[PDB]
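Hi support team,

I'm opening this ticket because the web form for multi-chain structure prediction keeps timing out on my end. I have pasted the exact lines I submitted so you can reproduce it. The total is 103 residues across two entries, so I didn't expect it to be a heavy job. Is there a limit I'm missing, or should I split the entries? Thanks in advance, R.K.
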Amino acid sequence: QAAVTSTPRAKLNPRNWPSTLVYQEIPGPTTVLLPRDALAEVRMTNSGVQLAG
Amino acid sequence: LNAVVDLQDRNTELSYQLLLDSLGDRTRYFSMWNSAVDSYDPDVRIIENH
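Hello R.K., no limit was hit. The queue was backed up. Here is the completed structure from your submission:
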């Protein structure tokens, strides 16, 4: 078992593990759907329109 | 996000009072909405002293 799984090391129980050898959780990129339109609400508000909701 | 943007100057009570008159008769009483129109006696404001 050890051969099959354990990482080959020059030192049992190292005091610190390199970033390469530690399991890193890598989530997928997070997409966001921006609700507002930046310019449109400026144009409407300057007109006199009073937005809500 | 509240969608009821109410101003300080509009009058949504007087508007509703006017709206009903143009929508119906405003003479017959409706108990449910308590819509008995406020009125005065025609011959007590302009008293006609025969």
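A quick check on our side: The interface with chain B takes residues 50, 52-53 of chain A (CB under 8 Å). Let us know if the file doesn't open in your viewer.
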